[PDB]
Amino acid sequence: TKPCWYWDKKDLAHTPSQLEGLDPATEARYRREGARFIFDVGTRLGLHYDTLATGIIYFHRFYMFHSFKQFPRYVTGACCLFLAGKVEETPKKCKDIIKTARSLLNDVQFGQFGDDPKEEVMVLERILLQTIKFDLQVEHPYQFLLKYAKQLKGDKNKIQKLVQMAWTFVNDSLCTTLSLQWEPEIIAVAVMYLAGRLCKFEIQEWTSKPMYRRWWEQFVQDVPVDVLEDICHQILDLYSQGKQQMPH
Amino acid sequence: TKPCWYWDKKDLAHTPSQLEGLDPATEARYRREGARFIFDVGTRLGLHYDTLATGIIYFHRFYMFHSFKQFPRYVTGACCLFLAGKVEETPKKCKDIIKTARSLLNDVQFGQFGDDPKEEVMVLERILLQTIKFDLQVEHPYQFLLKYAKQLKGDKNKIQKLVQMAWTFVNDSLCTTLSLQWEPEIIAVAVMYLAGRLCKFEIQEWTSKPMYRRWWEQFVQDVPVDVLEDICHQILDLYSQGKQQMPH
Amino acid sequence: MSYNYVVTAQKPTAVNGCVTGHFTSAEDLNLLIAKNTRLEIYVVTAEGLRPVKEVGMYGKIAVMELFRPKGESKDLLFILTAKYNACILEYKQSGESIDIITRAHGNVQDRIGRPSETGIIGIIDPECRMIGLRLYDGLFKVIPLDRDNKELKAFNIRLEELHVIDVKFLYGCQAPTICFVYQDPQGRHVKTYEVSLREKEFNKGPWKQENVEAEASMVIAVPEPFGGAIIIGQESITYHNGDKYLAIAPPIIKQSTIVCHNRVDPNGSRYLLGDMEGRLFMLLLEKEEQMDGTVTLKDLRVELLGETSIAECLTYLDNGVVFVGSRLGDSQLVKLNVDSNEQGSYVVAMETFTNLGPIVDMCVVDLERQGQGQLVTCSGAFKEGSLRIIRNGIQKLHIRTVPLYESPRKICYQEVSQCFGVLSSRIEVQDTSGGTTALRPSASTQALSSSVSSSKLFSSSTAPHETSFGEEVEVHNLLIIDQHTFEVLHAHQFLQNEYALSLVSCKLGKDPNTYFIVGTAMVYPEEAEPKQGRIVVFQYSDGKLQTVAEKEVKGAVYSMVEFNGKLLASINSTVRLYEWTTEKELRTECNHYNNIMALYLKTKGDFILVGDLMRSVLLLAYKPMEGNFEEIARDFNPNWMSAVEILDDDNFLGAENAFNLFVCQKDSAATTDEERQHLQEVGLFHLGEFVNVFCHGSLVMQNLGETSTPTQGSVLFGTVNGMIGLVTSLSESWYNLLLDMQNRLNKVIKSVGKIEHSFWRSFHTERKTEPATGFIDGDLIESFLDISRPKMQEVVANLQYDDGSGMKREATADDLIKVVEELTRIH
Amino acid sequence: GQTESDWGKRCVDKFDIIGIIGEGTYGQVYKAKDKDTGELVALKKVRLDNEKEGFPITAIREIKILRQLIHRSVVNMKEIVTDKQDALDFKKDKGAFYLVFEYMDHDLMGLLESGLVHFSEDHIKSFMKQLMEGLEYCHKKNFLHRDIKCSNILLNNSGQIKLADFGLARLYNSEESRPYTNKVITLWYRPPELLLGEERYTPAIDVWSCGCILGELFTKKPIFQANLELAQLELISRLCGSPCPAVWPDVIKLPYFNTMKPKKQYRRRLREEFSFIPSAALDLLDHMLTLDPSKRCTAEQTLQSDFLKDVELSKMAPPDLPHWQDCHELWSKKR
Ligand SMILES: Cn1cc(-n2cnc3c(NCc4nc5cc(Cl)c(Cl)cc5[nH]4)nc(N4CCOCC4)nc32)cn1
């Protein structure tokens, strides 16, 4: 019916980028660069948050089938955001995205677009649609983070601090391969799980089963704690690596 | 194995004669005319009664497969009597039957025999044998009227009056399609049934089962009174049409 | 755009209705015969019929009844058309000037309503209080016969019984009472309602409902002496009036379905009846006057009078003469004698009115190999089946009739054998011998030579269906008929339950022998879509017909046609092209499947016009390079096709089941491949007739001398009502001239019932109504030579004639008389 | 699980194009047969040649919306194919894409306009039940077909009905969201709110269109037939009553309420002019053809109607098409 868009962590060592000589650190860097590029460009254009993530997920899935060396990262990222705009019904003209790209890219980085930046992007749309198998509908952990928080009852200010901090973790998780590792529902629970430990919150108390120590089960079934700890470990790797500190 | 020679009353409306424009009254007349023609000619020739009925049975069966308009009635009846003579071991020359026919027929009726009366009849013998499917052995209600009356014991004059009166009804039933509707055993019982009602005889008293009011059942099995009344109604219709009264 | 011109060559001949009354004068006895678009008025004499007037109406005459309201000197006529145009007419004659007056007129169509199954019904109260119309299921329309109701305003009374079979206004009731036979899941019943003009609703009926025969057909309003009604069925005739109930079931009427009735005695004692086999009966109502002075019905009687033509409508005139109005055969005037003749028949034919009847197929052939064409048609059905040879005389038509006494289907001409090929079907009934027996001798049975297909193609494989006695069966035959004597030289009887559907005569491949080819279909009681069929090739040579080859197909061969030495045959949804091998057998080359029911086929060069049961028309081209078909263009407007024809390489002509002719053409614009594949309907025209066969040719003398004629091309067509017409194309200059005259003639010519001509010729289906375009009603243009001289000049006013390239001279009446007289020479 | 799920990688060479069958929402509809499987499919062109914004957004709507919807009464996009990309430079490929749908036997448009089919009451029940089950399914997913026509209603010989195009389909949101195209449904099936200028309309626009289809199956003729919006609003008023604040409180909100006024203030004559329709179906028609879209019934409520509640989808009951005796009509059976 629908294609599978999820791999295992061990499979990332065999991406077309890895197999062409790129080291694991460079592909992860190229992914964060492309993710933040799609994030910053669409933010400058005033785009909805679902449109940003949809293009980022298109971007992440694209370089599971192709190599970063053969397709320029910033040329591909612009095409994903352009397609994501028409997909999520928040469209922008291709010339408007190119204009924003020149603002945020230096002379070296913008050279990927070649002599005709618009044509290099419009051309890549055919390969993008074929690579993503025309599976345009993509859901994101944001709607699940909100669907689960409404079922929480208690201190409104404590729950609101939990949501924004988890929402920050979802924005940061876009820079990672987590979008490909796990379904969006599990990611929304893991960011609740991480923000609960940092904020010292007992999330089980706000649920309909205040005693259910596995508070996550009432939201997403069949989720072991090993997965939640694994996702939390990946998100916090960005904070310790970069210059940003944990929200807390 | 052996062919079926019995139809239903409702089927007579679809004879080949009926479907060519002939009305029901005319075909019934053509059958009565042809029957007495076979009857009167063979009687002049001094033929046995089984031979006369055998030709009449051939005659009745023949015009269930053919039309009176396509085959002349008196030419066919002469051919039936000629074949019936050789079947019942009472043979006659074809020239002798033609001679008797011309004596009792007017110029118009004998004109059906054409320029060569013998050949027009002798030719029809092939078509007659094929039409009757070479089923030459024919049984008649006469032998059953006598076989059943022999088992009757009582007033000799009353039983003999029953036999002759029923025998008269058998001769009259040859003019009708009853020969094609029912087996000869039922006809022999029906003429006993009719002569019993007219003479007001209670035939069960003369039987071996004097209280078995349905006396005929020990003779012919599975015969309802509806069939006997149907046959009796048809036989008396011949007398009521010609205004003649019961023999008595 | 395309521009065409349609004229009537032979007016409709089939009688759809006839009534007797006193319309022209209170003294004369009139017989008003109703054809599809023509109304003929006659005066009954002691020697026969005397014509007085014939008028044309802008509509199909559906209801026609004569009535005389309180205060009128003579009877008036009410006519309702198929397009719901209603009118009341009066005859007025001032010496030699005969004119038909429109007393009232209007259109009684409702915005919402399901058209009934049994068709439009029109009844008038015996006291002439109202006009009863049954136009839609569950609705009874009432037109009150008021002196001031000149617009024919009407109201609808809701009817619970939706499916009504027939309805009449009863006699002898104080209030207006209707009696109708309806069919519900509980069978068929007869019911009565009282109509109230004041309340505008139904009241309680006189007598209660009774369960009647399952095949109740017609209702007979018995007049005042007896009262009540008579219900005619398939096997029984029943009389219902109050508590009295009588039912006669003679065995004679069961053999064939009774279809028409008429009253002989105004007191209602005797009635005329007719069946599908042409038999004429007399329904006798025995009356027993009782010791109270009142005359109830003793019994009912039916007597066989004789044989007439298969009549659509019967009417008793006077002195024992009856007009037999037939739609499938020739109409008749018959004499009823009190004494039977030597054959037992009380009926003797007086006169015979030629009726071309149903024209199933026809071909134009130059018998006396001159340039003047003759038209040979397959006409009539059942015993009334015949061939008709029509030629232009030296102005009327000379028609020779060759009776066949069986149903003709398709005809084809083979000049190599100086003979015709005719497919025919006869009805035989399962007899007691197990076989079948024909009702009457016909051409297939009275043929000089005869043969039967001994093919074993379908063998025993098909399950042997059960046969009961009395079941009708159709036997199809191929007749070989001489072109001069029209003698049935040979008759080939096809297999049992095999129907002959298509027939062609042509040479094939490199074979010089000219063959008759028949496409057949195996028809079984399951019907649906035949799944077996045969294509048979015959050669008639030296007086003997030889079976050359047979090809088994998996469906019905609805039509065949030869082009490029190859046989193009349509089998159900498939269109196949066969090749004639050197072994005298058929071989499939390429196929096309994108159809529902490929019925009609026409060819010109390598193009193929496909007429589907629906889907309209598709253009197919045989591509000799690839060897496969390819869709070129298709008309995407859905139409139920009845006959197709190719006009030129870009224009196509078709006929719809809604009595409409249309012409599609390739748009040839914007250079888009999608626009090109879109056949655009550029011509629309409501003909009013059901076209069965289109045929290229003309019966007029055509000289190879080349001269600019206003008409280009000639296409003849035959219809169900016997009408034969002609379609031809025009230049854009001539179209605008003739179209401009039509608008001028409409303002001048007064139409019967004041029906607008533009409404009559407008394309009309049950779902869509469009104005006519691309067609010139030639019958309206040719009417210019019949209006008075002052009206001619009224048409030519401000009209400029363009014969002189220099100056656009003002048109004289003679300038238009020259033009119209030239258009009258094309037919 | 590439297989079947991988789209856009297959070429149009695998399909042999028979010809055009009709005109759809965005492009002309084509018929073809798969070389490998032999199945007949319906194709739709993409035509990405216009480099203004690349792939058409109206096509992106139909790909996203139709791939989410799966039902027995909705035509599901089978796959998506492209032209041959023969150059090694994906920049030189200007080829278009094709949408592959499942092919159905006939369409309500072709069947009714030709006049061959006849619908009994049980056939209309089977038609409306499948039609409303599919419409309720899509309405539950917050989608609007916006183009309910007889040409977009497909039927196979079994008796199953399916909806077709969805090219003009958008998403519905109770929050005003985006103002939409006021004219979107064929004028004969256009709701009264759409004639008066409602740009943000409710899902009741498809309920009204199907209501005109329900009555069209009983009369064999379209209900409202007009060439202009004012003439169309007039015919709707002659049957359902003139739009007035009495039966339609929010009729004042519509812009063209004062602009497009009917000739008279007609009374509702729907039950009178449809008296021949069974009471169970007439009750359904009256609710579906209610002027006020807030008072107009929903797709779910029609399935809870005396006409459709007890209809069973196991009895397909295909519309009976006359056969063989239709070859020559107006014969034998005359009067
Ligand atoms: C967007 N979308 C469409 C489909 N879809 C699937 N199946 C058909 C189909 N099949 C019956 C059918 N009717 C035919 C009429 C003719 Cl004249 C011919 Cl030649 C062949 C025919 N076949 N028809 C149609 N349309 C009907 C008319 O106009 C537009 C589309 N769409 C279809 C799936 N998604």
Residue numbers in the entry:
A (entry chain C), B (entry chain F): 20 to 267
C (entry chain A): 1 to 394, 708 to 1140
D (entry chain B): 713 to 1047
Question: What did the original publication write about this model?
Answer:
Cyclin-dependent kinases 12 and 13 (CDK12/13) and their cognate cyclin co-activator protein, cyclin K, regulate transcription elongation and termination, co-transcriptional splicing, as well as RNA turnover. CDK12/13 control these processes in part through phosphorylating the heptamer repeat at Ser2, Ser5 and Thr4 within the carboxy-terminal domain (CTD) of the largest subunit of RNA polymerase II (Pol II). DDB1 functions as an adaptor protein for the CUL4A/B ligases and regulates biological processes such as nucleotide excision repair of DNA. The CDK12 inhibitor SR-4835 promotes the proteasomal degradation of cyclin K, contingent on the presence of CDK12 and the CUL4–RBX1–DDB1 E3 ligase complex.
